[PDB]
Amino acid sequence: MGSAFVFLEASLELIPQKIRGHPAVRADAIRRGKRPEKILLDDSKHHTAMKSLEFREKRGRPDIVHQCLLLLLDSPLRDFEVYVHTLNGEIIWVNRETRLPRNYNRFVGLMEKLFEERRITAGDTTLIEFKDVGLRDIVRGRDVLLFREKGGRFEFSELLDGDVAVCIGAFPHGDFFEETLRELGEFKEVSLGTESYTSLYVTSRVLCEYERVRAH
Amino acid sequence: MGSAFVFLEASLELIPQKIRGHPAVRADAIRRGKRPEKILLDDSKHHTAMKSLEFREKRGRPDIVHQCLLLLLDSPLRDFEVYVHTLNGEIIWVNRETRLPRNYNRFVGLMEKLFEERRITAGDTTLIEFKDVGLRDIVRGRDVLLFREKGGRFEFSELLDGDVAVCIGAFPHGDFFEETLRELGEFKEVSLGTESYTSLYVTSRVLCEYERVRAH
Ligand SMILES: N[C@@H](Cc1ccc(O)cc1)C(=O)O
Ligand SMILES: N[C@@H](Cc1ccc(O)cc1)C(=O)O
Numbered sequence: 001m002g003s004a005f006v007f008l009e010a011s012l013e014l015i016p017q018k019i020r021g022h023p024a025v026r027a028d029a030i031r032r033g034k035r036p037e038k039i040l041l042d043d044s045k046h047h048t049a050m051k052s053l054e055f056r057e058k059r060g061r062p063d064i065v066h067q068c069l070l071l072l073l074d075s076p077l078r079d080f081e082v083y084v085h086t087l088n089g090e091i092i093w094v095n096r097e098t099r100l101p102r103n104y105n106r107f108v109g110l111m112e113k114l115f116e117e118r119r120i121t122a123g124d125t126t127l128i129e130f131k132d133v134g135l136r137d138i139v140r141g142r143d144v145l146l147f148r149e150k151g152g153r154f155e156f157s158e159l160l161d162g163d164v165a166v167c168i169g170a171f172p173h174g175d176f177f178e179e180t181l182r183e184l185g186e187f188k189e190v191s192l193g194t195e196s197y198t199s200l201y202v203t204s205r206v207l208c209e210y211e212r213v214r215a216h
Numbered sequence: 217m218g219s220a221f222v223f224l225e226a227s228l229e230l231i232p233q234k235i236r237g238h239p240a241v242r243a244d245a246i247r248r249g250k251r252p253e254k255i256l257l258d259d260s261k262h263h264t265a266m267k268s269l270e271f272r273e274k275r276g277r278p279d280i281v282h283q284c285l286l287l288l289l290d291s292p293l294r295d296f297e298v299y300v301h302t303l304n305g306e307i308i309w310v311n312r313e314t315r316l317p318r319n320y321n322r323f324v325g326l327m328e329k330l331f332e333e334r335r336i337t338a339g340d341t342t343l344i345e346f347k348d349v350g351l352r353d354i355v356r357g358r359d360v361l362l363f364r365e366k367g368g369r370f371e372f373s374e375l376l377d378g379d380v381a382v383c384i385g386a387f388p389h390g391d392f393f394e395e396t397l398r399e400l401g402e403f404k405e406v407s408l409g410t411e412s413y414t415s416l417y418v419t420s421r422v423l424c425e426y427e428r429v430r431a432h
Contacts (some may be wrong), residue, residue: 015340031247042319044321044322061316061318061426063319063320064318067283067286067287067318069416070283070416071283071287071416071420072419074410074413074414074416074417075407075417076413102277102279102280102283103258103260103279103320104279104319104320104321105260105320105321106260128297137378191294195292197292198286198290199285200286200290201287201290201291203288204424205424206303208420208421208424
């Protein structure tokens, strides 16, 4: 039932209710020509409005998952599914054949449309859609590999054997929520080295190892 | 004298003179709060003004080199220099230690500042600067490896031996200008496979092979 890549705690959400009246948000609403509740949170635009938010260090960074998805979906290997788990626990499925906008502003608009319409389609074919399941459900039947600095050292030919779920954080700061780790069930923690790497770099390195083994 | 990565024909330029009076450009100038001549060409904003441009299929795509630079500079391996050759033949040197903005709009602003001021600095240290040389000069003393689909099949341990210049196009469509190829001098053409891949994917794959050999 195949492998999957799952981006965890992706920094992807609409502007939270309680900051929608802030001047920085109202100003962006005017510039964008739509209501605050429809706009994706982006700390390059909304920073001054975000002071009161919980876990703020994780929030307002849709650029991270944008770039990771672009690279991953550019792979010529088509034997995996792609999911995005958001900071708020929502599950988005991305059809392996989806061509995402390469321009960040166009990506943001597409994500806004996704949050509004709940699915993006090519006629009868679904390209991107929220699923009414949790993180625990998309890792069913797959060996979960959680990439974290504190993890262990393993041979990739062994790691990327059968059906795997490659799980990489897509947020800029902090550690995984305890809830996220509980949802993963059984998992193996895998480290690439003694330093904190970016989501994009980890995606790149893991994709390369994955293709080495599996394309093969 | 070390290896280098060179992004070729990067789609990075200010709005050309002859389209500065177009309504789409004047509208963006108002939104940005500065003169057309200072604004980076971006076909997600300026498409309708670009109809009369030569080699238009290559132009207005700074997102491509943005993402490739982010990934490359995220590498933990510090034994290489980084250059960007633009569509107009300009040479930009990027200090290996530079942290580029991850947000595309902030990157665009930094590139606009670079074109205006000609250098970006951390006090006395240069982070990014135009160099008064040509493409032929930055590949002096290095084995040029030009990544193209029509190239040959080689072992990477042999390819990435001594001082190399890894050259990857950073434009969306078309083929290299003949002038660009002439500037490279002696070079080996290297193919990754029988398909056209994105700049980001090629950067990722080559970086991974480079690190395998050299980090080692
Ligand atoms: N690439 C590292 C692997 C590693 C991973 C985590 C560590 O804590 C240490 C080492 C090496 O070969 O050394
Ligand atoms: N990765 C390819 C290499 C290749 C490159 C260019 C080609 O035209 C063909 C094959 C392989 O192992 O088959």
